[PDB]
Amino acid sequence: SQVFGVARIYASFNDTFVHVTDLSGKETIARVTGGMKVKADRDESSPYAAMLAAQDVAAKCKEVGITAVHVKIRATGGTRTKTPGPGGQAALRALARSGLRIGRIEDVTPVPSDSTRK
């Protein structure tokens, strides 16, 4: 009975990105990053900024008709930190608090598999 999108939470250090797309991942339903909801340029990675961004993402998601979101959460990855930064828990918590049903949480960070350091 649901309509499922996908969340594409990118929770790096220094920033977070909540970017709901459709089930293909091609067309985008309301990407708002964390650094635009509050702006002193150091508070952009914060749980508060991820909270604001995820809440208005879920507002536009219920506007377009999406009642439930598969969540795919990634870190900065590559040859770098590989840990979901401070915005990931808050973006997922605001995306669940603002009405959307949550399905299939999965870490999708790019594990580099013999990276290009030296």
């Binding site: 459709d22 089930l23 991942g25 299939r104």
Partner: protein, 219 residues
């Protein structure tokens, strides 16, 4: 300077839904937005290169495929539906990270095979060495001649399980994990080898369209 203004683009989107082929259980996987089918770049042309990456737990209904996400490529589109074909299969990264433990060897194989069509697949496999019951020593490593012999029998058995399957027969083959039991029964006179998996099936090149075969796959 001056940037642009706004016109709401979710009035000119259309909610096509996606049908899964008959190789699975319950096959209405979701919906998709695409721009409305105006003349000069219709919607049915802006589709057809779209893959959806869905979970086999939903595509089979049972939860014991909670890993193993598969990919469906839109090929035909009619009746506000999307007619999808098997385009890939992966594991979730936390599955193989839940498999790898030290003091054992992982053997992995990958072959480039062609099915009974002119599809070519790169099909992978991973397999972890097991310590037996009544084994006292902690290691159970492989002796690397055993790794060559195991990788040889694995490459032979999955290049035999393809070329003797279609994509319908191969998706129907890797739904109930039965190539894994084939590998284990072929391997258990070299090393024990716990949790063989296939981990990845990659489409490389596809033959032609064949709309009648697509519609016969669906029903």
């Amino acid at each position: 300077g001056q940037k642009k203004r706004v016109v709401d683009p979710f009035t000119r989107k259309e909610w096509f839904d996606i049908k899964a082929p008959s190789t699975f259980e319950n096959r209405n996987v979701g919906k998709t937005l695409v721009n409305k089918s105006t003349g000069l770049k219709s919607a049915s042309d802006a589709l057809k290169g779209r893959v959806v990456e869905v979970c086999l737990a939903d595509l089979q209904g049972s939860e014991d495929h909670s890993f193993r996400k598969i990919k469906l490529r839109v090929d035909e589109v009619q009746g506000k539906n999307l007619l999808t074909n098997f385009h890939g299969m992966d594991f979730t990264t936390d599955k193989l990270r839940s498999m790898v433990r030290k003091w054992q060897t992982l053997i992995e194989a990958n072959v480039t095979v062609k099915t009974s069509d002119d599809y070519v697949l790169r099909i992978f496999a991973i397999a972890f060495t097991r310590k037996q019951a009544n084994q006292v020593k902690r290691h159970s490593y492989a002796q690397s001649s055993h790794i060559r012999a195991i990788r040889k029998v694995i490459s032979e058995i999955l290049t035999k399980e393809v070329q003797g399957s279609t994509l319908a027969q191969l998706t129907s083959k890797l739904i109930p994990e039965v190539i894994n039991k084939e590998i284990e029964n072929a391997t258990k006179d070299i090393f024990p080898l716990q949790n063989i998996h296939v981990r990845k099936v990659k489409l490389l090149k596809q033959p032609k369209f064949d709309v009648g075969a697509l519609m016969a796959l669906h029903g």
